[PDB]
Structures are given as structure tokens and as C-alpha cells.
Amino acid sequence: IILEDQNCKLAKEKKLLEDRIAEFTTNLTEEEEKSKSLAKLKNKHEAMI
């Protein structure tokens, strides 16, 4: 009986964690490209300079 309440609680938490991970992981893709793209942008000014 105690495991049912604990298992049910972990089930809802696991479902919400995976759903929230996609909301943050999706932004990491855009930030990863923007962060990496900005890195080469600084090198462009150095090469142009």
C-alpha cells in the first residue's frame, strides 16, 4: 500500500520531469548554435582585424 502511493507519486514526477526536460533541452539546441556561432563571430573580427 505504501509502495502504491510512492510509485504513483514517482510516476507523475517522472512524467513531468521528461516533459519539462524537452522544454529546456529544446532551448539548448538554439543556445548551443547561437553560443557556438557567436564564438566564430569573434574570430571573424580578429581575422578581419
Binding site: C8, K12, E13, L16, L17, R20, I21, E23, F24
Partner: protein
């Protein structure tokens, strides 16, 4: 001019350090924000259950 150029690199380092400190807080902000979402959203399920 030559001294200010080298000095500018040292001054620019402080900006990155200050930005890293400010950005570091945002790192834990997103982590805590995502954790609060899993907890705040779970709070609604707690009352429902």
C-alpha cells in the same frame, strides 16, 4: 595606444568575469526554475490526489 590595447584586453577580462558571475546565477536560475516547475506543477496534482 599600444599600452591601452594591452590594457583593454585586461579590462575586457573583467567584463567576462563579471558576465560569468551574472551568467552563473542564471545557470542555477534555469535549474531551480525547471525544478520549481516540476514541483509547482506537481503541487496541483497533490491537491487533486
Amino acid at each position: 595606444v599600444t599600452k591601452l590595447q594591452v590594457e583593454l584586453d585586461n579590462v575586457t577580462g573583467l567584463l567576462s568575469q563579471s558576465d560569468s558571475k551574472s551568467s552563473k546565477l542564471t545557470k542555477d536560475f534555469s535549474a531551480l526554475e525547471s525544478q520549481l516547475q516540476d514541483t509547482q506543477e506537481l503541487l496541483q496534482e497533490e491537491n487533486r490526489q
